[PDB]
Amino acid sequence: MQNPQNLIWIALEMTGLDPDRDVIIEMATIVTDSDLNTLAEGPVIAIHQPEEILAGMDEWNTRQHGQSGLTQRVRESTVSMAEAEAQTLAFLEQWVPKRSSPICGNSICQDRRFLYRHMPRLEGYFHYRNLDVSTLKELAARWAPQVRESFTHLALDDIRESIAELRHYRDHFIKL
Amino acid sequence: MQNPQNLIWIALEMTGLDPDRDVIIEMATIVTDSDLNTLAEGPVIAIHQPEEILAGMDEWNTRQHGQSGLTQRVRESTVSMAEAEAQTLAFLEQWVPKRSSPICGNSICQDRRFLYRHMPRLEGYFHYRNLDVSTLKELAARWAPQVRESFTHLALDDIRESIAELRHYRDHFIKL
């Protein structure tokens, strides 16, 4: 089951853009193999936060997490940050050994920074490498401008879209 | 002269790897066009730091920056963190518009962390995306190992090698 070549894909939602001042309010994970085939989907967790944190979000986050239903899910959740971290680690441990996988997704530097502050045990579970699908997005936009046009509010859909985007580049942008 | 397609490459030296404990002590930039041709090399700035900050460095950093001469350059420098940020912004503004270029280089999530904390105006001048060559290296390691295998003491050589590493992957790992 564990395989050091498997990939951990993660997507977070936050109350804001500052990893040190804002907090995580949703997380989800998916594990693929090294050739991007989905092995298992992880839990989608809304992380409880006090009401003043929800009220303090800026106008974009207030509207977006409001109409997605996440704000209400956060208020109703009884899962703390630490419980969400432990639940996610308990899933990932079945599929990927410690320190093996890069953190995989779109602009996952932002996600790693939030994990380092708020879920450092989970952050430390990753290899130090980042696998950033948006690096390839930027290169394709400049070098193959319509490989980019040949190619999501639910968490697992967002991650599936990131895996699909990398599959698209492996097939039409990368020379294997 | 400004072109929203131009890429900003950056390299930093720090007293250590933790932005809460450590500070930037050297910075350098290079601007390329979208096809990795040098347009201009920016200033290489040693950033002054008081002696207790220089004393507060651990063993590996105290030795590595002492031996390279950076510590002495920092002790002597009359350029503050804010002035170095302004000097670098004055250069980049001649070539790239605001919020257009991602941060380009290797291990540039760590750079973004330091810029966010210590040079927020320069950090905000970049597009929020990262163009990390190590994403390509990780993919080549899994999917085309011979390309990774078939491929920096001073700041401008250090950046130029990162540009040469991307160029290598464009020529042997990207199909165009």
DSSP strand pairing (A45-46 vs A24-32): antiparallel
A8, A103 Cβ separation under 8 angstroms: yes
Alpha carbon B47 to its chain centroid, in Å, reads 14
List of chain B residues whose C-beta atoms are within 8 Å of the C-beta of residue A170? 139, 143
Q: For chain A, how many structural domains are there in total?
A: 1
Read off the CATH number of the domain in which A145 is found. 3.30.420.10
List of chain A residues whose C-beta atoms are within 8 Å of the C-beta of residue B144? 174-176
Distance CA A8, CA A30 (A): 6
Solved how? X-ray
Count of beta carbons in the 10 Å neighbourhood of residue A82 = 12
DSSP strand pairing (A7-14 vs A103-105): parallel
Distance CA A147, CA A169 (A): 8
Phi, psi of A158 (to 5 degrees): -60, -45
Nearest chain B Cα distance for residue A176, angstroms: 6
- Exposed / middle / buried, residue A73 (Cβ in 10 Å: 0-12, 13-18, 19+): middle
List of chain A residues whose C-beta atoms are within 8 Å of the C-beta of residue B170? 139, 143
User: What contacts A125, CB < 8 A, 6 or more positions away?
Assistant: A8, A89, A92, A98, A99
Distance CA A71, CA A53 (A): 10
Say if the Cβ atoms of A174 and B170 lie within 8 Å.
no
Distance CA A124, CA B134 (A): 19
Classify the C-alpha dihedral A121-A127-A129-A130 as positive or negative: negative
Active site residue A169: no
Resolution to one decimal, Å:
2.1
Alpha carbon A91 to its chain centroid, in Å, reads 15
Best mutation site among B36, B118, B127, B175 for testing chain A: the one with the most A CBs within 10 Å?
Answer: B175
C-alpha dihedral (A51, A57, A63, A65), degrees to nearest 10: -60
B150, B172 Cβ separation under 8 angstroms: yes
**A4, closest residue in chain B (CA to CA):** B142
- Exposed / middle / buried, residue A95 (Cβ in 10 Å: 0-12, 13-18, 19+): buried
Q: Evaluate whether residue B1 is within a structural domain.
A: no
Of B5, B134, B135, the CB nearest to A136: B135
Say if the Cβ atoms of B34 and A142 lie within 8 Å.
yes
Distance CA A19, CA A117 (A): 7
Q: Evaluate whether residue A1 is within a structural domain.
A: no
Extract the tokens encoding B144: 């085309």
Of A131, A142, A174, the CB nearest to B138: A131
- Exposed / middle / buried, residue A150 (Cβ in 10 Å: 0-12, 13-18, 19+): exposed
Q: What is the DSSP string of A90-153?
A: HHHTTTS-TT-SPEEESSHHHHHHHHHHH-HHHHTTS-S-EEEHHHHHHHHHHHSTTTTT----
| Domain encompassing residue B134 | 7-173
Return the half-sphere exposure (C-beta side, CA atoms, 13 A cut-off) of residue B85.
Answer: 18
**B135, closest residue in chain A (CA to CA):** A131
Q: Evaluate whether residue A2 is within a structural domain.
A: no
A20, A29 Cβ separation under 8 angstroms: no
Say if the Cβ atoms of B174 and A112 lie within 8 Å.
no
B36, B60 Cβ separation under 8 angstroms: no
Distances in whole angstroms, Cα of residue A85 to Cα of each of A26, B64, B76, B127: 11, 37, 46, 30
Nearest CA to A31 among A111, A84, A85, A88? A88
Of A112, A137, A175, the CB nearest to B175: A175
Extract the tokens encoding B16: 């250590």
Say if the Cβ atoms of A129 and B134 lie within 8 Å.
yes
List of chain A residues whose C-beta atoms are within 8 Å of the C-beta of residue B132? 109, 130, 132, 135
Distances in whole angstroms, Cα of residue B81 to Cα of each of B18, B102, B158: 17, 22, 21
Best mutation site among A37, A130, A146, A166 for testing chain B: the one with the most B CBs within 10 Å?
Answer: A130
Partner residues linked to B40 by β-bridges:
B31
The CA-CA-CA angle for residues A95, A99, A100, to 5°, reads: 55
DSSP strand pairing (A103-105 vs A130-132): parallel
Partner residues linked to B174 by β-bridges:
A174
